[PDB]
Amino acid sequence: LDLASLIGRGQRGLIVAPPKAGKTMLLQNIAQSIAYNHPDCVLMVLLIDERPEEVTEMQRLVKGEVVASTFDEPASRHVQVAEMVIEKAKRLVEHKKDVIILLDSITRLARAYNTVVPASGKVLTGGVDANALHRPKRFFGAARNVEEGGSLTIIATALIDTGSKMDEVIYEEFKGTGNMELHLSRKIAEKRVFPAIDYNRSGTRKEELLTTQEELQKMWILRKIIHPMGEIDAMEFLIN
Amino acid sequence: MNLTELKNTPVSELITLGENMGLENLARMRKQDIIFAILKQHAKSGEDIFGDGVLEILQDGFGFLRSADSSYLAGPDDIYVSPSQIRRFNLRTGDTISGKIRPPKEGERYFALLKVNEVNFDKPENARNKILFENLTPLHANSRLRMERGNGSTEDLTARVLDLASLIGRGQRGLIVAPPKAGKTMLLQNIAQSIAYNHPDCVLMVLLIDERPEEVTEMQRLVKGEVVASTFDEPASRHVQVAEMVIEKAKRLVEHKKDVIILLDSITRLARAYNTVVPASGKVLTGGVDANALHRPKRFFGAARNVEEGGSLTIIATALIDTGSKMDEVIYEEFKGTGNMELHLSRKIAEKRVFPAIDYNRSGTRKEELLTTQEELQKMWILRKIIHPMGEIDAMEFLINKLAMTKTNDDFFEMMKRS
Amino acid sequence: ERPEEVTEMQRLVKGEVVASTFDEPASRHVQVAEMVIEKAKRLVEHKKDVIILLDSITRLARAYNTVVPASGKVLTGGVDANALHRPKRFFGAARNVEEGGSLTIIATALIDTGSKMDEVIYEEFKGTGNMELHLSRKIAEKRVFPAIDYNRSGTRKEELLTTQEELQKMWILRKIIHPMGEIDAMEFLINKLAMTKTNDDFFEMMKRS
Numbered sequence: 031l032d033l034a035s036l037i038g039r040g041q042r043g044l045i046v047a048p049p050k051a052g053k054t055m056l057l058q059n060i061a062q063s064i065a066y067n068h069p070d071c072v073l074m075v076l077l078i079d080e081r082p083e084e085v086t087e088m089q090r091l092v093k094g095e096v097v098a099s100t101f102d103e104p105a106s107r108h109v110q111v112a113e114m115v116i117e118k119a120k121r122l123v124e125h126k127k128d129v130i131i132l133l134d135s136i137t138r139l140a141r142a143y144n145t146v147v148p149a150s151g152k153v154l155t156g157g158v159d160a161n162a163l164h165r166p167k168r169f170f171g172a173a174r175n176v177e178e179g180g181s182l183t184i185i186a187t188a189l190i191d192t193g194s195k196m197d198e199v200i201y202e203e204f205k206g207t208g209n210m211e212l213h214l215s216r217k218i219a220e221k222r223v224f225p226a227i228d229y230n231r232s233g234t235r236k237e238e239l240l241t242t243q244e245e246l247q248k249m250w251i252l253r254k255i256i257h258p259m260g261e262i263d264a265m266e267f268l269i270n
Numbered sequence: 271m272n273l274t275e276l277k278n279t280p281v282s283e284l285i286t287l288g289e290n291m292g293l294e295n296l297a298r299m300r301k302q303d304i305i306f307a308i309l310k311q312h313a314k315s316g317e318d319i320f321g322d323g324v325l326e327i328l329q330d331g332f333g334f335l336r337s338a339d340s341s342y343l344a345g346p347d348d349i350y351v352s353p354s355q356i357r358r359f360n361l362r363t364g365d366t367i368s369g370k371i372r373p374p375k376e377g378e379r380y381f382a383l384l385k386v387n388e389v390n391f392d393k394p395e396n397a398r399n400k401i402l403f404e405n406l407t408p409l410h411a412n413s414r415l416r417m418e419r420g421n422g423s424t425e426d427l428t429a430r431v432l433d434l435a436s437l438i439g440r441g442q443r444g445l446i447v448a449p450p451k452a453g454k455t456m457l458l459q460n461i462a463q464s465i466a467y468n469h470p471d472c473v474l475m476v477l478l479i480d481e482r483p484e485e486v487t488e489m490q491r492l493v494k495g496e497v498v499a500s501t502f503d504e505p506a507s508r509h510v511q512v513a514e515m516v517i518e519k520a521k522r523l524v525e526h527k528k529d530v531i532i533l534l535d536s537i538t539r540l541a542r543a544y545n546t547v548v549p550a551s552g553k554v555l556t557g558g559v560d561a562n563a564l565h566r567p568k569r570f571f572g573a574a575r576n577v578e579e580g581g582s583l584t585i586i587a588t589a590l591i592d593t594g595s596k597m598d599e600v601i602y603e604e605f606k607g608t609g610n611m612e613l614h615l616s617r618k619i620a621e622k623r624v625f626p627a628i629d630y631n632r633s634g635t636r637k638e639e640l641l642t643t644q645e646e647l648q649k650m651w652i653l654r655k656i657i658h659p660m661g662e663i664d665a666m667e668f669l670i671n672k673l674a675m676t677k678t679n680d681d682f683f684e685m686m687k688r689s
Numbered sequence: 690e691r692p693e694e695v696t697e698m699q700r701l702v703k704g705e706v707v708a709s710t711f712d713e714p715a716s717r718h719v720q721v722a723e724m725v726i727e728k729a730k731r732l733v734e735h736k737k738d739v740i741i742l743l744d745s746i747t748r749l750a751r752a753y754n755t756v757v758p759a760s761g762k763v764l765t766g767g768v769d770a771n772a773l774h775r776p777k778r779f780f781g782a783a784r785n786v787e788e789g790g791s792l793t794i795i796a797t798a799l800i801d802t803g804s805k806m807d808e809v810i811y812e813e814f815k816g817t818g819n820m821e822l823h824l825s826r827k828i829a830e831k832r833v834f835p836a837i838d839y840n841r842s843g844t845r846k847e848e849l850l851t852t853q854e855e856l857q858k859m860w861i862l863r864k865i866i867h868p869m870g871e872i873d874a875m876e877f878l879i880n881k882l883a884m885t886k887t888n889d890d891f892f893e894m895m896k897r898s
């Protein structure tokens with residue numbers, strides 16, 4: 031529940047969910063957990079291009095300010111609210127104060143950038159511009175910890191398997207750049223923890239004759255660590 | 271003698287009135303021109319008469335007033351609205367105005383407006399101070415739209431089927447997805463006449479675009495509420511301006527703490543028309559559709575909401591599925607997930623002629639807890655448990671079978687629980 | 690100009706004004722032009738600052754072209770090089786002096802009139818001024834005044850006029866206002882400058898934002 035328990039202080043993180051998986055109330059619970067457990071930190075709930083009633087519910091069931099953009103207006107509103115929230119976050123960093131950002135959703139912001147960014151000829155499979163990639167990279171890497179005083183941290187929300195093709199490319203590049211990524215659905219858990227790409231690469235050579243410790247480096251530890259819920263197992267991918 | 275009475279009357283009354291008092295060769299011109307000419311000739315006696323219609327403002331400051339029976343068409347029947355009227359009665363688009371009209375003197379062709387006597391079915395003076403729609407606060411669909419008609423046909427059986435499969439709320443935002451030849455138009459009928467029979471208090475509005483003329487004329491003579499429809503013969507701008515003016519008129523109506531329901535068939539056609547008419551932005555997606563084109567129908571759909579302090583705006587819009595054209599998909603997943611409820615249909619159920627063809631498992635609603643009570647929520651959840659296992663066609667056959675012998679939905683519930 | 694607005698602006702502003710009516714020939718417009726510029730330059734030469742406001746340079750150039758005899762070198766549309774030569778010198782007379790004095794000139798030009806004369810003078814004159822303030826009619830539909838768009842408005846040599854604090858804050862405003870929409874920019878600027886009393890507090894409230 032507590033953000034320090036889940037996201038800690040100063041480090042970025044993601045949560046990824048499919049449609050019809052329980053996003054709104056989970057974000058609500060995270061919001062009041064932040065409000066009660068750490069009232070000192072400045073709450074910041076943000077929404078992009080979703081139904082106005084849920085925007086009102088979010089901004090009415092929490093205490094922090096909720097700058098949100100409903101799904102009526104075009105994506106220029108979304109992009110410019112993105113720069114202005116990141117600039118006010120930077121100002122609060124210069125203000126020597128911790129902030130928490132609940133953004134929903136980064137896939138929405140990314141493909142809004144994709145459909146708004148001017149054409150540059152660097153498109154890829156699916157017409158994804160490179161600018162619409164490293165501008166989100168700049169926004170997502172601006173969430174670095176403050177080493178001089180205080181600590182900014184953000185919790186990310188992403189949507190998966192929405193019946194489209196644009197979302198999984200940005201999902202896999204977030205996987206490439208992700209710090210921690212909470213998961214809800216079934217298959218993508220195994221997709222991440224046991225990379226099918228790496229499994230196929232290994233199986234192409236079958237049991238590769240890894241000499242000496244190279245074979246023993248790949249280790250898997252399951253420790254039934256003590257948890258307040260009671261004996262929640264923790265599984266770790268030990269490498270050399 | 272208002273414009274509405276002679277506008278609504280058929281050709282026989284028009285030609286009889288023309289030949290009675292001295293109209294020559296009046297049978298060979300378009301009906302709007304006929305009513306214009308005959309009403310001008312009658313008003314040449316200087317008798318002020320009442321008027322009715324919906325106003326709109328073009329690029330210039332001058333405004334026009336149209337009639338509902340004319341399918342919101344710009345023609346000779348249009349009524350002048352001077353900008354001075356806009357200032358002196360804070361007029362904005364979509365306001366329904368009733369008042370004395372002015373016969374045309376030399377220099378003008380149409381009819382002006384002498385005075386205003388009823389603005390939005392209300393006194394013009396007390397409506398000067400009013401709350402704008404922009405700052406209104408959205409809310410959930412707390413009020414259930416009980417559309418169970420209880421008349422005693424299999425059409426009522428379809429009504430009960432979507433009662434048991436959907437939760438229609440007052441002020442919600444709904445999407446319907448179905449393949450062609452599945453039962454969309456008369457499902458919308460079901461909705462229309464069920465609302466008319468069960469909820470006469472709320473006004474019913476049915477918007478039809480690029481539909482066949484026979485469907486339009488059978489829809490106009492079947493629904494109790496007023497219906498606006500523009501066929502495919504007219505260009506894209508016709509449909510676009512119809513949709514804009516009707517949605518903003520519903521906005522003005524719901525601003526008066528009124529319950530407005532708009533049945534749209536379809537929304538994909540509206541998106542196609544908007545893409546056709548909108549200037550190109552240079553950022554085209556798959557299927558020849560650019561980015562900014564989809565914004566307009568998409569804010570159009572987003573206009574639906576429920577007002578906390580009074581009034582509700584419900585939009586039930588249909589979306590085409592698997593028609594073989596890529597842009598139909600493009601719109602399908604562009605609007606997917608933006609509605610308070612989704613209603614899915616399958617063509618294979620219609621192939622075996624089991625009707626309706628609603629996919630029970632796929633159909634769903636958002637925030638059922640606030641809309642209904644806990645007891646009926648669990649009572650529908652247990653049906654979801656028992657009907658989820660077998661196939662959707664088998665599910666519908668089972669449901670219609672053991673619902674045919676049952677008079678109402680409640681008795682169906684207490685007849686299932688004992689089993 | 691019509692008499693009414695001329696008389697009105699005569700006692701809105703305390704500065705001396707010379708105005709001429711349309712019906713009288715353009716020759717007297719030319720003469721009053723040379724006397725006003727000559728007295729202005731004499732006052733500048735006396736180490737005294739001069740500020741001139743003019744409306745409109747391209748249309749008075751049109752009038753001069755109509756009244757000047759044709760030298761025989763006819764450009765496109767009947768324009769003559771000597772026809773635009775005199776207005777060109779008139780506009781270029783603006784000349785700051787390091788020894789002393791100044792001759793600031795602020796002239797306006799009119800475009801989108803249906804006759805391409807004013808256009809031809811526009812692209813013959815643009816780029817010859819130390820600043821430029823584009824203005825468009827697209828703002829007056831929404832009834833917002835002034836109609837001064839900011840993205841494509843610019844000036845030459847900002848680095849010398851004032852301190853780089855104002856420069857950097859103006860740059861921040863530019864970069865937060867340029868990519869975003871034009872009508873959006875106009876409403877944003879009018880609102881954000883509405884409740885703020887002064888420009889210093891306005892810069893401060895961007896800085897805190």
Ligand SMILES: Nc1ncnc2c1ncn2[C@@H]1O[C@H](COP(=O)(O)OP(=O)(O)OP(O)(O)=S)[C@@H](O)[C@H]1O
Pocket residue numbers: 424425428448449450451452453454455456457625626
């Ligand atoms: N409840 C019902 N009662 C009677 N006939 C029904 C019912 N449901 C479906 N049908 C039959 O379904 C057929 C197709 O219905 P339509 O409403 O015309 O299909 P559609 O989904 O509207 O697709 P369009 O309008 O042709 S593009 C008709 O021949 C109806 O007789």
Ligand SMILES: [Mg+2]
Pocket residue numbers: 453454455456
């Ligand atoms: Mg039909």
